[PDB]
Design an enzyme around this catalytic site. Structure first.
Site, PDB file in Angstrom:
ATOM      1  CB  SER A 437      -0.931   0.011   1.217  1.00  0.00           C
ATOM      2  OG  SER A 437      -2.198   0.515   0.864  1.00  0.00           O
ATOM      3  CG  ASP A 516      -6.006  -2.816  -4.441  1.00  0.00           C
ATOM      4  OD1 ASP A 516      -6.766  -1.844  -4.203  1.00  0.00           O
ATOM      5  OD2 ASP A 516      -5.037  -3.125  -3.713  1.00  0.00           O
ATOM      6  CG  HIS A 548      -5.907  -2.626  -0.546  1.00  0.00           C
ATOM      7  ND1 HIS A 548      -4.911  -2.152  -1.375  1.00  0.00           N
ATOM      8  CD2 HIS A 548      -5.595  -2.194   0.697  1.00  0.00           C
ATOM      9  CE1 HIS A 548      -4.043  -1.455  -0.669  1.00  0.00           C
ATOM     10  NE2 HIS A 548      -4.435  -1.466   0.592  1.00  0.00           N
TER      11      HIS A 548
END
Ligand SMILES: O=[N+]([O-])c1ccc(OP(=O)(O)O)cc1
Length: 573
Positions: A437, A516, A548
């Site tokens: 991330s 994601d 995600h």
């Protein structure tokens, strides 16, 4: 070297529990990772009881004792287009989809038994909703990410990142809706709970400390809450994880400073294992909470004994791979002090192979809390450095907001320093950067802006281009990005690794979930295209039917296995 897989899969497989509340009369509602996926359980002192059918993402907060549980499950194969399901506790394993709510990014929610109040996000808005016997009602459209905190009567309290990185407090009415937003010139609110007097008790994080205030909604007045016991007030906490009223009126608070928390009940500190704790609930008179630590997967214990109710025991050997751990204060570029958690691996020499593992967020923090990545990394033979770069939570408001409008600027300078510290302190013989991330964004910012610093880096579900990611974002993220960047396209362009790829000099391993919707794959495919042309060295792993949120042991493996393989390979030169 399979001797690696054995341990990494084991660390991943350990059952992990989180606490949600007391439901079905008097049974704890818990979310645990077990069986190879995320599920919801009722615990009553013996065997646990699965509530859902297939894997879920989470459950909405339930008021004490309600006879149902609202499951939140992604029905988009990872893209996080949640659908809400209702389950009666007497009839476990039967679900009724709440068809009144069309799939969306469900941010938070609570269930009073009669009404379901949550906040969701769509391509066009983040809103506060309420679904009761009369159907779905939108109570208010919000500026950005907003989460529901507590409901007492018609009063709804929540937390909202509505601007400039500050968290504001908002109220709304369950029957008439509406929205009030209280800002605090001194900082941000970190938690909220409605008092029997119908005022909002909240944690307030200022530049320095964190304090307890009372906010009268009827106007907006703020005053320091005075507790019955003075213990609490003499500890000077940096943040407040969570606070809330128990059925008997006592005020439960969990405060933290320097990566560890304490639990107070009406201001009286209750003994709890060292590490960090989730919410506190009253169960059969006794106090339950969730406990975690760099050497203890999220479990659920009793207070003050610390005796465990539900816990995935971490094996002796694997337990033994973390030779030690410290909290260090890396000296940054501007003279700033970067609290950094370090983990010496019992399987590496000193100096030896080190990984600067960068936390995501950015509003998160590396604390005394179980981290699967660092653990397996220790397992694979690497010391782990986890710097709470500017933008991190847990060290005051001032430190947290220093990142606003300055991404791939100051925080990156803090990450570099952690490396500099790892090398000059004697701990490191070689250095790697790894992160998922914002952490993976950082790997990309380090490899490009600062070639030569690390021997190689691992970027998972990484940020690649603020411009494109922006135009591919729903209302919550687009706004969130408008806040991190300050909104200027000069920052979005200049602070995007995709534009400084010519600078890369080290081996890169890209790991990305195909669906994601937080950090889209599209830009990452362009990056790979850029890497190819410029004749740069790289490997990549795109993961099937996943987003995600990693909620199955197969996706966790697909994400961590390639990482540890990459680094073990670079380590042998
Ligand atoms: O869009 N964004 O600004 C953005 C997207 C994803 C991010 O990563 P996360 O913090 O781990 O959810 C962080 C920032």
């Amino acid at each position: 070297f399979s001797r690696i897989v054995r341990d990494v899969e084991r660390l991943i497989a350990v059952e992990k529990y989180s606490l949600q509340g007391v439901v079905d009369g008097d049974k704890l509602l818990v979310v645990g990772f077990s069986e190879g996926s995320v599920n919801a359980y009722l615990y009553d002192g013996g065997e646990t009881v699965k509530l859902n059918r297939e894997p879920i993402n989470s459950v909405l907060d339930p008021h004490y004792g309600v006879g149902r549980v609202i499951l939140v499950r992604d029905v988009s194969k990872g893209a996080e287009q949640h659908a809400l399901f209702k389950v009666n506790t007497s009839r476990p394993g039967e679900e009724q989809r709440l068809e009144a709510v069309k799939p969306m990014r469900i941010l938070s929610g609570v269930d009073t038994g009669e009404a379901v109040v949550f906040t969701g996000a769509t391509e066009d808005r983040v809103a506060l909703y309420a679904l009761d016997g009369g159907g779905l009602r939108e109570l208010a459209r919000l500026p950005g990410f907003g989460f529901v905190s507590d409901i007492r009567g018609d009063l709804i309290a929540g937390l909202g990142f509505f601007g400039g990185g500050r968290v504001s407090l908002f109220t709304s009415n369950l029957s008439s809706g509406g929205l009030r937003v209280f800002d605090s010139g001194e900082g941000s609110f970190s938690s909220a709970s409605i008092s029997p007097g119908m005022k909002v008790t909240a944690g307030l994080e200022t530049a320095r400390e964190a304090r307890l205030v009372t906010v009268d909604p009827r106007d907006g007045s703020v005053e320091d809450l005075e507790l019955p016991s003075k213990d609490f007030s003499s500890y000077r906490p940096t943040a407040i994880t969570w606070l809330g009223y128990l059925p008997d009126g006592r005020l439960a608070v969990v405060a933290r400073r320097e990566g560890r928390s304490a639990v107070f009940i009406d201001g009286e500190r209750v003994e709890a294992p060292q590490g960090n704790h989730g919410r506190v609930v009253l169960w059969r008179g006794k106090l339950v909470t969730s406990h975690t630590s760099l050497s203890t997967p999220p479990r659920i214990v009793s207070l003050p004994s610390g005796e465990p109710l539900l816990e995935g025991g971490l094996p002796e050997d694997l337990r033994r791979s973390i030779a030690g751990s410290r909290l260090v204060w890396v000296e940054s570029f501007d003279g700033s002090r970067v609290p950094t958690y370090v983990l010496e691996s019992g399987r590496a020499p000193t100096p030896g192979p080190t990984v600067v593992l960068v936390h995501g967020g950015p509003f998160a923090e590396d604390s005394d809390s179980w981290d699967t990545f660092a653990a397996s990394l220790a397992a694979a033979g690497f010391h782990v450095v986890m710097p709470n770069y500017r933008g991190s939570t847990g060290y005051g408001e001032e430190w947290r907001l220093k990142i606003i409008g300055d991404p791939c600027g100051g925080e990156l300078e803090d990450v570099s320093a952690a490396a500099r510290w790892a090398r000059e302190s004697g701990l490191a013989s070689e250095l790697y950067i790894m992160g998922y991330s914002y952490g993976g964004y950082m790997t990309l910012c380090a490899l490009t802006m600062k070639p030569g610093l690390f021997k190689a880096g691992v970027a998972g579900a990484s940020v690649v281009d603020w411009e494109e990611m922006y135009e591919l974002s729903d209302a919550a993220f687009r706004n969130f990005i408008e806040q991190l960047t300050g909104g200027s396209r000069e920052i979005m362009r200049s602070r995007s690794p995709i534009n400084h790829v010519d600078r890369i000099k080290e081996p890169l391993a890209l790991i990305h979930p195909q669906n994601d919707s937080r950090t889209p794959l599209k830009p990452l495919l362009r990056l790979m295209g850029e890497l190819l042309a410029r004749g740069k060295t790289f490997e990549a792993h795109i993961i099937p039917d996943a987003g995600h949120a990693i909620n199955t042991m197969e996706d966790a493996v697909k994400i961590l296995l390639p990482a540890v393989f990459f680094l073990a390979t670079q380590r042998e030169r």
